[PDB]
């Protein structure tokens, strides 16, 4: 209810000032469920891809973080095959001053600069560390299959 007012405010912000490189809006008539797209950033092995996100807002948002998950497959140490994201501002580092806009920037920044030391899928992190160009090649390959 207060969460609804604040979700409405954010949407107005997206209206008045449309972000570059991302899109998000409600799913149907449900303001507590959103959908979004991220561009793969140009530095990454995901350049050229667009990744799809599903977003749920809890009833006491913004005091508790939204649930965010990829619905596009991606080769990434912190994003597993369910689309779950290991990102600090999404659990312990969440703040009621953060917005969905900044969450997307972060996820995008997470794509450009992975955190292999606290990985969600161990095997990818080991390849990321041991063999970078192995990692970037298969990331690019997954980008071509799932993200085009």
């Amino acid at each position: 209810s207060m969460a609804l007012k604040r979700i409405h405010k954010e949407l107005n912000d997206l209206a008045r000032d449309p972000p570059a490189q991302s899109s998000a809006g409600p799913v149907g008539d449900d303001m507590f469920h959103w959908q979004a797209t991220i561009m793969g950033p140009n530095d990454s092995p995901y350049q050229g891809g667009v990744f799809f996100l599903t977003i749920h807002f809890p009833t006491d948002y913004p005091f508790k973080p939204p649930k965010v998950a990829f619905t596009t497959r991606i080769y990434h140490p912190n994003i597993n095959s369910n689309g779950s994201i290991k990102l600090d501002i999404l659990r312990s580092q969440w703040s009621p001053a953060l917005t969905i806009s900044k969450v997307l920037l972060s996820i995008s920044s997470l794509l450009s600069d992975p955190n292999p030391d606290d990985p969600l899928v161990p095997e990818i992190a080991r390849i990321y560390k041991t063999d970078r160009e192995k990692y970037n090649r298969i990331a690019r390959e997954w980008t071509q299959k799932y993200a085009m």
Binding site: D117, D118, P122
Partner: protein, 76 residues
């Protein structure tokens, strides 16, 4: 050679090591001095986490270097 290990509190210890010593050897040297098990030790130098099978020279840790010691968690 001489190096220092530092914790989040500022607490500083000093080790004698060799450039060919491995991160496992270094962690074992920290166990001796501080009673912390190698399994609980996470070493970080110049932003990078140090891996158990590599040596100090592999990261070009040189004389009077400071490593950082934190808790190795399960993750992730």
């Amino acid at each position: 050679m001489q190096i220092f290990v530092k914790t989040l509190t500022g607490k500083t210890i000093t080790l004698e090591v060799e450039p060919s010593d491995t991160i496992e050897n270094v962690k074992a040297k920290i166990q001796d001095k501080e009673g912390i098990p190698p399994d609980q030790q996470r070493l970080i130098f110049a932003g990078k986490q140090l891996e158990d099978g590599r040596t100090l020279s592999d990261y070009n840790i040189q004389k009077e270097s400071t490593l950082h010691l934190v808790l190795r968690l399960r993750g992730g």
